[PDB]
Amino acid sequence: VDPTHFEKRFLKRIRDLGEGHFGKVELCRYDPEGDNTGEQVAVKSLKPHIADLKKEIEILRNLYHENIVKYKGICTGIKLIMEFLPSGSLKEYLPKNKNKINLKQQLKYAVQICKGMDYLGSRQYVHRDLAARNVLVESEHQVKIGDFGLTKAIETDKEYYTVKDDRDSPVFWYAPECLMQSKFYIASDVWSFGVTLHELLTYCDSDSSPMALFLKMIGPTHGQMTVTRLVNTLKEGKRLPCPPNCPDEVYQLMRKCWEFQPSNRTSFQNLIEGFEALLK
Numbered sequence: 328v329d330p331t332h333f334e335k336r337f338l339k340r341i342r343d344l345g346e347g348h349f350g351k352v353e354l355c356r357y358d359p360e361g362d363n364t365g366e367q368v369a370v371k372s373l374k375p376h377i378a379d380l381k382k383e384i385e386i387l388r389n390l391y392h393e394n395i396v397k398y399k400g401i402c403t404g405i406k407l408i409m410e411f412l413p414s415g416s417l418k419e420y421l422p423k424n425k426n427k428i429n430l431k432q433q434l435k436y437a438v439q440i441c442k443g444m445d446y447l448g449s450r451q452y453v454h455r456d457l458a459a460r461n462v463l464v465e466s467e468h469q470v471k472i473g474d475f476g477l478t479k480a481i482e483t484d485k486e487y488y489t490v491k492d493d494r495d496s497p498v499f500w501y502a503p504e505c506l507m508q509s510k511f512y513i514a515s516d517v518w519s520f521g522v523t524l525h526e527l528l529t530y531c532d533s534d535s536s537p538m539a540l541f542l543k544m545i546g547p548t549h550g551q552m553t554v555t556r557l558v559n560t561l562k563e564g565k566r567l568p569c570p571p572n573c574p575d576e577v578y579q580l581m582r583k584c585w586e587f588q589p590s591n592r593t594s595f596q597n598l599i600e601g602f603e604a605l606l607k
């Protein structure tokens with residue numbers, strides 16, 4: 328028997344966890360004994376794109392890191408089986424736990440995301456969807472990168488992957504090169520980290536979201552010119568403001584993620600040293 332092969336007949340749905348445009352994550356119990364004693368697992372499936380989910384499954388199967396959600400297996404069409412993290416994402420957790428989470432804990436979460444991202448980077452992968460909604464909460468002390476739906480492999484001796492299909496893109500988290508030429512470098516993930524760091528520092532407050540803040544800067548009435556206006560503001564050197572109660576030294580580390588040219592951005596290794604210096 329293969330412990331990574333899950334039988335559909337024993338995979339019992341409890342409740343929905345969340346959904347995207349094409350994919351959904353559900354809480355299930357894998358109950359072969361039929362008595363509700365089986366382990367609870369997170370299950371990713373496509374709504375009634377199979378090729379992309381199969382590639383996501385193979386990517387996650389070969390990632391092994393404390394700050395990366397654990398692959399458990401598959402249910403053959405296919406479903407992706409992972410460990411279940413009941414606290415859900417930072418987007419859902421932080422607004423409900425401001426009393427539990429202080430700056431020091433926010434900076435440790437920041438270091439944790441950089442380590443998981445730095446490991447993905449070392450495996451020649453670009454995430455392309457690094458946002459707080461994709462960071463899962465293991466406990467009040469630990470976070471994990473929780474989804475790899477847009478992840479792509481960067482070729483050896485090549486510095487980026489060029490994306491053909493940009494239809495479901497989080498443009499308010501995207502670096503200028505991604506917006507202008509659909510070019511995804513590891514430095515593009517560093518740009519997205521800075522935006523995810525802004526979210527985490529504002530406790531994922533809806534009124535202060537990256538989307539809300541940028542629309543206040545560029546104007547909300549440009550329709551189809553919105554990405555063009557976004558690129559214009561970025562070219563002008565304009566950036567997301569300092570989160571309230573965020574010290575300048577943390578803001579300055581965030582500003583280095585957003586250097587217009589990919590080459591001038593601080594790397595994940597560099598950011599880790601930065602946060603650890605502030606924690607000590």
Ligand SMILES: COc1ccc(Cl)cc1-c1nn(C)cc1NC(=O)c1cncc2cn[nH]c12
Pocket residue numbers: 344345346347350351352369371396409410411412413414415416419460461462463473474
């Ligand atoms: C990263 O999260 C998502 C990614 C894609 C989709 Cl389609 C939904 C969610 C989602 N939305 N929300 C609101 C919560 C989600 N997920 C969880 O709570 C969850 C818990 N334990 C383990 C895993 C693995 N993937 N997701 C997990």
